[PDB]
Design a binder for this molecule. Structure first.
Ligand SMILES: [Fe+2]
Ligand SMILES: [Fe+2]
Ligand SMILES: [Fe+2]
Ligand SMILES: [Fe+2]
Lengths: 213, 213
């Protein structure tokens, strides 16, 4: 697939949940689009009241751009469920592979997929928005906000890159797994499945967790 | 989805297998596109050596247009298998619903779907072409070419409209079912599952069968 508006909405929403803002160069690098085209699209989104400038070089979605993103992510996330549950596309690959089929996911397909597998989250734990673009508020927090000896459950991975998902899969840090914070100096080190894992800051920033209970 | 070149290739291939040719008005009606746009696309296909005029008002694909159609139908037919086997989209609806997700079916998805379900035909029995656009020749014939008392097995439905598939499903005339020709005057009447069914000519023309054995 070549790049669409919906791809811009998704990456901008991810970067904002991940680090608090989207830059042109971060969008350029994720979408593999030249900066100047990224600039034209951002300005177009701003003129449509779907994005706004936060300060210099830093952007985010407006509330209405966020709902539009959400209507797309309903398609995206359901496509991931379809691909991973029906045909065994690996957990860490399924974000990339959903890219083809997601644009044409109809409500017929989306709803039958949701009811057939009994899910309301993508395999990476992000909730599936409703058709209007609403998502239920989830009570979770950044794993980087936790003190040593905190116990928690991994909730969702808000930014789904290859390096990130591969690390998480390799170390079994997946939605639903109980973890315990061992250390927070330089990296975030946790206890999971009796094993100890150092999570570098760039990866830890993408991990949301729910604190018991 | 709005209309693409691939949609033109598919309907033209179907109409040719069905009645021996495609007219502008038949393409217009199937794709819901005004005749003039259908005309521009046909001329474009002709200039690309993907279609040719047979005689007045009658068109078909060239060999190379047929292979291109086939590369698309690999996507289409696999999408149908995915949708009907993974999530239970009804047999008679699955041709329409594949329309969204088919354009982005990658070889990764296509191949894992084929191996996961163990299929080399769509639910309506049409073979799944290979990535290059080849299909294995199938030894089947039109049900309208058969004499009374012939026995056969339904092979494929080469033209998949709503009226056609609905009739076939309603009367259990599906790939694999054994049938016996009872009569060929006005309609084609067959014996299937101990029941007798009159198949009108417009529907019978789309049914291929293999004569035993
Ligand atoms: Fe994703
Ligand atoms: Fe996901
Ligand atoms: Fe079909
Ligand atoms: Fe089919």
């Amino acid at each position: 697939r070549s790049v669409t508006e919906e791809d811009y909405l998704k990456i901008i929403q991810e970067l904002v949940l991940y680090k608090g803002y989207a830059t042109l160069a971060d969008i350029s690098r994720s979408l593999n689009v030249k900066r100047q085209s990224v600039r034209d699209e951002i300005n177009h989104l701003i003129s449509l009241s779907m994005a706004e400038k936060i300060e210099r070089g830093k952007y985010r979605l407006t509330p209405s751009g966020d709902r539009e993103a959400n209507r797309f992510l309903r398609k995206h996330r359901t496509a991931e469920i379809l691909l991973s549950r029906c045909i065994g596309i690996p957990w860490e690959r399924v974000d990339e592979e959903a890219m083809g089929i997601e644009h044409g996911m109809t409500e017929e397909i989306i709803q039958r997929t949701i009811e057939r597998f009994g899910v309301d989250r993508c395999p990476h734990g992000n909730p599936i928005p409703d058709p209007e673009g609403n998502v239920e508020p989830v009570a979770d927090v950044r794993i980087t906000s936790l003190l040593p000896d905190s116990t928690a459950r991994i909730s969702r991975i808000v930014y789904e890159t290859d390096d990130i998902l591969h690390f998480l899969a390799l170390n079994g840090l997946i939605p639903g797994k109980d973890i315990k914070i061992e250390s927070v100096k330089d990296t975030v080190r946790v206890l999971v499945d009796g094993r100890s894992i150092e999570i570098p800051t760039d990866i830890a920033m993408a991990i949301m967790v729910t604190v018991d209970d």
